[PDB]
Design a protein around this nucleic acid. Structure first.
Ligand SMILES: [Mg+2]
Ligand SMILES: [Mg+2]
Ligand SMILES: [Mg+2]
Ligand SMILES: [Mg+2]
Ligand SMILES: [Mg+2]
Ligand SMILES: [Mg+2]
Ligand SMILES: [Mg+2]
Ligand SMILES: [Mg+2]
Ligand SMILES: [Mg+2]
Ligand SMILES: [Mg+2]
Ligand SMILES: [Mg+2]
Ligand SMILES: [Mg+2]
Ligand SMILES: [Mg+2]
Ligand SMILES: [Mg+2]
Ligand SMILES: [Mg+2]
Ligand SMILES: [Mg+2]
Ligand SMILES: [Mg+2]
Ligand SMILES: [Mg+2]
Ligand SMILES: [Mg+2]
Ligand SMILES: [Mg+2]
Ligand SMILES: [Mg+2]
Ligand SMILES: [Mg+2]
Ligand SMILES: [Mg+2]
Ligand SMILES: [Mg+2]
Ligand SMILES: [Mg+2]
Ligand SMILES: [Mg+2]
Ligand SMILES: [Mg+2]
Ligand SMILES: [Mg+2]
Ligand SMILES: [Mg+2]
Ligand SMILES: [Mg+2]
Ligand SMILES: [Mg+2]
Ligand SMILES: [Mg+2]
Ligand SMILES: [Mg+2]
Ligand SMILES: [Mg+2]
Ligand SMILES: [Mg+2]
Ligand SMILES: [Mg+2]
Lengths: 16, 190, 95, 166, 243, 116, 26, 148, 97
RNA sequence: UCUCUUACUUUUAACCAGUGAAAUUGACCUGCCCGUGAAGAGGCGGGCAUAACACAGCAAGACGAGAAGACCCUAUGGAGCUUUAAUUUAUUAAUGCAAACACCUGCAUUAAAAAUUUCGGUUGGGGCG
RNA sequence: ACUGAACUCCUCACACCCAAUUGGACCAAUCUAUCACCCUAUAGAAGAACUAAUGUUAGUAUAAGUAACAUGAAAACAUUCU
RNA sequence: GCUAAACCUAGCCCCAAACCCCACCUUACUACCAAACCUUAGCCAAACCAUUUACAUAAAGUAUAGGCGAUAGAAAUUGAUGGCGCAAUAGAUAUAGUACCGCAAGGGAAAGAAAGCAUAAUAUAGCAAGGACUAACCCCUAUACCUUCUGCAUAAUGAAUUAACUAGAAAUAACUUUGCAAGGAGAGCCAAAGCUAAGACCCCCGAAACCAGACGAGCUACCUAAGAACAGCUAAAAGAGCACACCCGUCUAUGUAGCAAAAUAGUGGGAAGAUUUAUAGGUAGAGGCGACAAACCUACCGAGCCUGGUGAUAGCUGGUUGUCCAAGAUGAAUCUUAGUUCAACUUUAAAUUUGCCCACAGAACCCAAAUCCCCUU
């Protein structure tokens, strides 16, 4: 088993 | 180049901040293998072969070769009619405009390298005239060099400077092997 | 060998070479034959004579030794009564 | 970003000579950053291309897609500004010369998947552009008849040369 | 960047600043000066040169001291410069064998010593080397007063040294009271080691102890400015009255 | 970034201009365009042999048609013209077949006569 | 920004050529 | 760099390694060719040819005693005390054409060189110098600047 | 798109400022001044490479030797690591032996 | 469960409206048969077929997609385990000898516990080399 | 018989079809010296060139407008009902 | 015409110089009750590994040391403010040690001023082009690229695509060009034409690991302290029966980027005990804990995690970026056959003089094809 890797939250929380 | 010391330096992957841990395991992730986030392949990683530290470019041509270069420069100026011998650098006035107009009238180049024997004995008038000029540069005899001789279109020498240069440059011919640095005492060397 | 020492940054000499080979200044390397002191009782006189001889090295062997030693070992040495003084130079060598 | 569509309304042509056909009026309008996929908007834009303003409004009023209401608002605004500012005499004398959808500036959001894995959602935005040209809608291109189509064939036959020779 | 000074000179620079600067000169010199301790755990070379048998040439020889570890218990005792040897050995004393960590420890004894200058008996953990050194010095007091700080290598030893030196400097009558003849005899016997009391006060003090001593010496509750201004006003009024 | 390439735009354009008439992403994406442009240039080079090969085949076909119009076969025509020392080549013979039918008729008659 | 002037000037020349082709002067 | 293997990887073995076979420079027995080399005394040769040449060109004055200092000052010989040079050895080469009357001090002298020197009416003496004295003699001015 | 769309601001170089005008003066201080001063003494730069040149490994060894005691802690650690790495590279890697 | 499956309901489904991913992806203008070929062809040879496009199904092929799969072999690559593999006893436990007059230091010997390190090559499928 | 190559001939021109490796002639862009002062020249330098590392970062595609997700009903929007 | 493209200073790099109110150790930021010091190891090199290696100049890589081997290596003595830097994927990680991730140690950002589509879907046939053509297609020719291989369209590897970034660092000895020349060199060094100076030449990413020092027992294993829960029926003081809560996880189906990095539905085992469970505390990495399953110790435990040594090492895989021309192809040893060294071959430059082909003559007794050798040519 290989653990999942989470991408940094800032990338997907951006707003205009 | 011999005076050159380039201060360009980059960080190798060792010196870039962080990058200790393996970003993700070898296997199973489906991603490329990596060992640190600061390897050259990564954005923000180290530079694989960059400029490394302050680097000197120092090297010495044989002093005979350098003296020969001075001689060749002098011969070239004389042969190309860019060399002018003055009895002295004394000027009627310390006004730079007088010096520029004199050069223009005598059809000297846009740039003139005036040479006088020693720093202390240089006439005050010429010192004042050349202190305010950019293309008329006044140097002592000990400062003469190929680079400035070439940079300046015309070379102005005084008679004492000519004698001094002849002596110093001809001495390189007809000298022994150095037994020790010429700064040390010799039987006949000032 | 060490191309750049950690203390001086210089090239080092492989002292195993110095303990085994003589360099003649011209560029030749002299050596003893291997086994010249081993089990002589079972070697024929001709073989012993061949083994007791000082022998030159190949061009490639000489090049290897030159690489493995530094320029100090490749200088002119004016020793008092060097047995190899005459051999230090070549004579009548065409190419 | 680009905002050339807005500028297209500000170009002033030289006054026309009396012995010159009356230049039809042209009104460019746009709505930017619509919360709608440009791919879905494209169908509405294509639907109303080349139709009269009234016909386009009628078609959009009875369309179930969300983009239809937005396009209708844009068309009504375009009609209003055509009358007020572009010297269009009749409101209805306008046809959709150009209507297209463009990509907008989108936002990235995370979609959580089932095993600690995820996807990147795109909060998609679209632009919508219209050009309204004054005059009746140009007639639809007539289907080519057998006569014309055989005429084309015979022209191709006559065009034949003796290739690779003197 | 680069530091203006080498990092190894930072302690000396600090000594030249602050209270450490106000410390007395003789104590600062005692700290600064460093002398190699007497060889204890190694046999020193006889001479500075030696004919090495391999090539028969005269080669310089140096005495490189063995690092000695002194556990804090030694500071409470008198080990005659002896300590722990924390080193390594080759199993069976052949370099081609395994290399093993080895600690050599001194044999420590508990002994009672009488100090003439202090007129006190001390029970001190000691080594046979220390006993031999005491014998060579002809007594504990002589050993303490002769052996320098480096050779003594004991905070207790240096405290004994300071006590004895202070006793000698003050000629303290507390040494055998009501026996002035005996006290004079002792002081005469140990006369050669006497030093000024101002110096005997700072013998064997660590840097922190010296700093605390200096701070205590130079701590003064600030004088109220009332007193200073009254003195100034009286002085000025005296000058005005005179003029 | 002491030295950075500043011409990459023009280096890319040099290749892309040759791919602008391709299909799909081969005319836009340099990675794909460059491979196809190299293939296009290699084909262009190798096609100079096939052009000459096909022209002669075309000439032979046309000469065969023209000679069959007169009862000759191409081998007979060519061989008999050679034997009569007429050194007209196949390009010229095809041109004559197309544009000078009476001259080609004369040559075919000459070839048949020589044959007989 | 990349230091240099020649690439920028080349691009300006290409832009000028394209402009002349698209809107050739009368 | 080639294709794969240690040579493309940049990790080929050290110089003199022969792939595991006992290397040539190790399979040859040790012999005392250079034993004590750094303690052997070395004497720079001074042929009578060279001496006559120097005298003829006036770089060595025969009217005064000729010692190692005069030879070095005339640049007739280069002494390297640091390289275990113990001085100058006279060499018979050029004896048959030596015609100079000279008082020369050297460290070694061949019998024939002595014969030539003496036949021309001169005197030759072999004088020893320890490394320190030799350094001072060869380069006196630096020594005088040492202030000792 | 890796091309700037505007010409960069003009770069004006004064070929006759004092530095350029007097460049090279006293490069012959020795041969024209009785060798009192060597030209390398005219070199202004790091103390450990004034009048000296070497590859990176030699430069790092010299830097550590001459100013190593004055270096900051992490700079000195980086220098020691660099010397170790360069030793390994120059003495164990390479096409030639 | 099956012979032997059927009917209905819900979910799913499909259409409409809203919102909107993931693996994947050299480019693809992406047919069938036989033959060939790095030995299994959409792409090569010979034949056959062949306007262009959605939508829904299927899972025969794309040696289909997922983890530099599973299994096997190699590396003077690791690591674990066991020992009558090799090397040690630093450390403890015993003793002995000195050393201090129970405790402790040094030196030996024997153990316990461990520690470090290695696993030559060529051949051999039903062996015992 | 003819057809049939990059063989050969013909008109013109020629350094212009191997892996690893090796020799050589040029050279983009950048900086420096000195020029030019227009967008270059002669030189000195160097983080000096990317169709390829399950390369790094960013953008945008494909799969795909697909998989998937969501609001019990009416109403006076008070409320009632299931 | 959309998305976008671009920009220049925010700062940074390398040198030089200079030596730089109140609250808070209790659960930190809470007004106020009776004790420090102690060899680094190991990776790595030795092609394993075990001793060993691996934490001014000149003398000199010399003396010395060394499984005398890899390699290590003196001293006597000598005396010594600037930028051919970066310019927002660069330069500091830095707008910030912030956001965010982690229990913790710890890790640690981003950013400011073309591609993809649409205008305009599509036409028989096919690496998508080329030769062409009046003409887009129709005709004819044409088995993507890279890498790895004896040999790849290969149904072997890699690649969706664009932009940016991303990989040859140096000595010994040569050769070339200068200088001077039996001397050269700005002490030391070399010298039987040498010496001095310059020019040219030695990559990137990737393990599993090992060791040092921290951090972890809010999960889980076990334990300590003091708590709590266990309906109903049957039975009577039960490691009792049935069976709720509760705990578990037998079997089946579903799910398999899922509701879920182990779930759902049903079914099932225990359910007053060796039970379950809240709270706080303890045991720590060659260690703990273990009703031994190599189980568990913060989702990936045959030995945790983080930082450092560390740019570990990799004879192994992958990658290695302008143009053009030229020469260029199949034995020995080796813990060695996935490698290397020598040879052979190969390339360059140089010297001078024979080289290949080659008939006649010639080359063995024992018991065929050919080959070797060389006058001529
Ligand atoms: Mg690091
Ligand atoms: Mg950085
Ligand atoms: Mg989750
Ligand atoms: Mg490769
Ligand atoms: Mg190989
Ligand atoms: Mg829908
Ligand atoms: Mg088939
Ligand atoms: Mg296929
Ligand atoms: Mg379908
Ligand atoms: Mg595999
Ligand atoms: Mg032909
Ligand atoms: Mg040909
Ligand atoms: Mg680069
Ligand atoms: Mg690119
Ligand atoms: Mg890539
Ligand atoms: Mg879509
Ligand atoms: Mg689908
Ligand atoms: Mg659905
Ligand atoms: Mg090893
Ligand atoms: Mg010294
Ligand atoms: Mg940054
Ligand atoms: Mg575009
Ligand atoms: Mg493939
Ligand atoms: Mg493979
Ligand atoms: Mg792929
Ligand atoms: Mg707990
Ligand atoms: Mg109950
Ligand atoms: Mg029960
Ligand atoms: Mg249990
Ligand atoms: Mg078991
Ligand atoms: Mg098991
Ligand atoms: Mg874990
Ligand atoms: Mg590596
Ligand atoms: Mg060729
Ligand atoms: Mg072996
Ligand atoms: Mg191998």
């Amino acid at each position: 088993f290989t653990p999942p890797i989470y991408q940094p939250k800032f990338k997907t929380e951006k707003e205009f | 180049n011999f005076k050159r010391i380039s201060y360009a330096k980059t960080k190798t992957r060792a010196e870039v901040r962080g990058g200790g841990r393996k970003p993700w395991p070898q296997k199973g992730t489906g991603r490329a293998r990596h060992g640190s986030i600061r390897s050259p392949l990564w954005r923000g990683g180290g530079v694989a072969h960059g400029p490394r530290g302050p680097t000197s470019y120092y090297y010495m041509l044989p002093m005979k070769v350098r003296a020969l270069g001075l001689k060749v420069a002098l011969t070239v100026k004389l042969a190309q009619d860019d060399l002018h011998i003055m009895d002295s650098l004394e000027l009627p006035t310390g006004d730079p405009q007088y010096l520029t107009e004199l050069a223009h009238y005598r059809r000297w180049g846009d740039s003139v390298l005036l040479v006088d024997l020693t720093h202390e004995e240089m006439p005050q008038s010429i010192v004042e005239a050349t202190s305010r000029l950019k293309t008329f540069n006044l140097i002592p005899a000990v400062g003469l060099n190929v680079h400035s001789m070439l940079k300046h279109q015309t070379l102005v020498l005084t008679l004492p400077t000519v004698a001094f240069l002849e002596d110093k440059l001809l001495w390189q011919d007809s000298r022994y092997r150095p037994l020790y640095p010429f700064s040390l005492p010799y039987s006949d060397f000032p | 060998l060490t191309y750049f020492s950690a203390r001086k940054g210089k090239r080092k000499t492989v002292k195993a070479v110095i303990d085994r080979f003589l360099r003649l200044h011209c560029g030749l390397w002299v050596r003893r034959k291997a086994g010249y002191k081993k089990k002589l009782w079972k070697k024929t006189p001709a073989r012993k004579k061949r083994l007791r001889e000082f022998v030159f090295c190949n061009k490639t062997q000489s090049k290897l030794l030159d690489k493995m030693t530094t320029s100090f070992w490749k200088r002119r040495n004016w020793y008092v009564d060097d047995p190899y003084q005459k051999y230090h130079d070549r004579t009548n060598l065409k190419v | 970003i680009s905002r050339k569509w807005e500028k297209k309304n500000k170009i002033v042509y030289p006054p026309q000579l009396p012995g010159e056909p009356r230049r039809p009026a042209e009104i460019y309008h746009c709505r930017r950053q619509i919360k709608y996929s440009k791919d879905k908007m494209w169908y509405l834009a294509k639907l109303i291309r080349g139709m009269s303003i009234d016909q386009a409004l009628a078609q959009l009023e009875f369309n179930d897609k969300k983009g239809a209401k937005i396009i209708k608002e844009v068309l009504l605004e375009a009609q209003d500004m055509a009358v007020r500012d572009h010297n269009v005499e009749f409101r209805s004398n306008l046809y959709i010369a150009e209507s297209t959808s463009g990509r907008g500036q989108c936002l990235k959001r995370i979609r959580y998947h089932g095993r600690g894995r995820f996807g990147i959602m795109e909060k998609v935005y679209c632009h919508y552009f219209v050009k309204l040209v004054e005059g009746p809608p140009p007639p639809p291109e007539p289907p080519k008849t057998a006569v014309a189509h055989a005429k084309e064939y015979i022209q191709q036959l006559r065009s034949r040369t003796i290739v690779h020779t003197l | 960047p680069l530091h203006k000074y080498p990092v190894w000179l930072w302690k000396r620079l600090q000594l030249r600043e602050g209270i450490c600067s106000r410390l007395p000169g003789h104590y600062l010199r005692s700290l600064e000066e460093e002398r190699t301790p007497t060889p204890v755990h190694y046999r020193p070379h006889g001479a500075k040169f030696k004919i090495n048998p391999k090539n028969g040439q005269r080669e310089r020889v140096e005495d490189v001291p063995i690092p000695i570890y002194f556990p804090p218990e030694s500071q409470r005792g008198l080990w005659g410069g002896e300590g722990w040897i924390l080193g390594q050995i080759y199993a069976n004393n052949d370099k081609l064998s395994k290399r093993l960590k080895k600690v050599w420890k001194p044999q420590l004894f508990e002994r009672e010593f009488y100090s003439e200058i202090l007129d006190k008996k001390f029970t001190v953990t000691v080594t046979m080397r220390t006993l031999d050194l005491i014998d060579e010095a002809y007594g504990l007091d002589f050993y303490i007063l002769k052996t320098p700080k480096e050779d003594l290598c004991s905070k207790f030893g240096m405290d004994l040294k300071r006590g004895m030196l202070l006793r000698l400097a003050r000629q303290d009558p507390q040494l055998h009271p009501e026996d002035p003849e005996r006290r004079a005899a002792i002081y005469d016997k140990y006369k050669e080691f006497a030093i000024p009391e101002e110096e005997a006060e700072w013998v064997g003090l660590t840097l922190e102890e010296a700093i605390e001593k200096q701070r205590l010496l130079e701590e003064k509750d600030p004088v109220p400015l009332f007193k200073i201004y009254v003195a100034e006003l009286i002085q000025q009024l005296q000058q005005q009255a005179l003029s | 970034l002491r030295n950075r390439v500043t011409d990459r735009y023009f280096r890319i354009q040099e290749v892309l201009k040759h791919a602008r008439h391709f299909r799909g992403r081969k005319n836009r994406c340099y990675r794909l365009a460059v491979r196809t442009v190299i293939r296009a240039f290699v084909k262009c080079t190798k096609a100079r042999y096939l052009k000459k090969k096909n022209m002669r085949t075309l000439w032979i076909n046309r000469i065969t048609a023209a000679s069959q119009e007169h009862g000759l076969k191409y081998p007979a025509l060519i061989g008999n013209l050679v034997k009569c020392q007429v050194e007209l080549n196949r390009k010229v013979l095809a041109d004559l077949a197309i544009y000078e039918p009476k001259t080609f008729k004369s040559l075919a008659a000459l070839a048949s006569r020589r044959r007989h | 920004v990349k230091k240099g002037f020649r690439a920028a000037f080349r691009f300006q020349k290409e832009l000028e050529r394209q402009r002349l082709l698209r809107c050739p002067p009368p | 760099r080639g294709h794969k293997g240690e040579r493309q990887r940049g990790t080929r073995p050290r110089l003199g390694f022969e792939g595991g076979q006992t290397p040539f420079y190790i399979r040859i027995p040790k012999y005392g060719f250079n034993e004590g080399h750094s303690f052997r005394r070395q004497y720079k040769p001074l042929s009578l040819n060279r001496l006559q040449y120097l005298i003829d060109l006036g770089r060595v004055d025969p009217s005064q005693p000729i010692d190692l200092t005069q030879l070095v000052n005339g640049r007739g010989v280069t002494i390297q005390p640091l390289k275990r040079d113990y001085g100058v050895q006279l060499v018979e080469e050029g004896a048959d054409t030596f015609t100079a009357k000279v008082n020369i001090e050297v460290q070694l002298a061949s019998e024939l060189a002595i014969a030539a020197i003496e036949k021309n009416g001169g005197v030759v003496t072999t004088a020893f110098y320890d490394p320190r004295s030799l350094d001072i003699v060869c380069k006196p001015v630096p020594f005088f600047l040492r202030g000792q | 798109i890796g091309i700037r769309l505007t010409l960069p601001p003009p770069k004006v170089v004064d070929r006759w400022n004092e530095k350029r005008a007097m460049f090279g003066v006293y490069d012959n201080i020795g041969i024209l001044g009785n060798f009192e001063k060597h030209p390398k003494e005219l070199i202004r730069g790091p103390i450990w490479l004034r009048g000296w040149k070497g590859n990176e490994l030699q430069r790092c060894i010299r830097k550590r030797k001459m100013v190593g005691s004055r270096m900051f802690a992490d700079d000195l650690h980086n220098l020691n690591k660099r010397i170790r790495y360069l030793y390994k590279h120059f003495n164990r890697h390479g096409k030639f032996r």
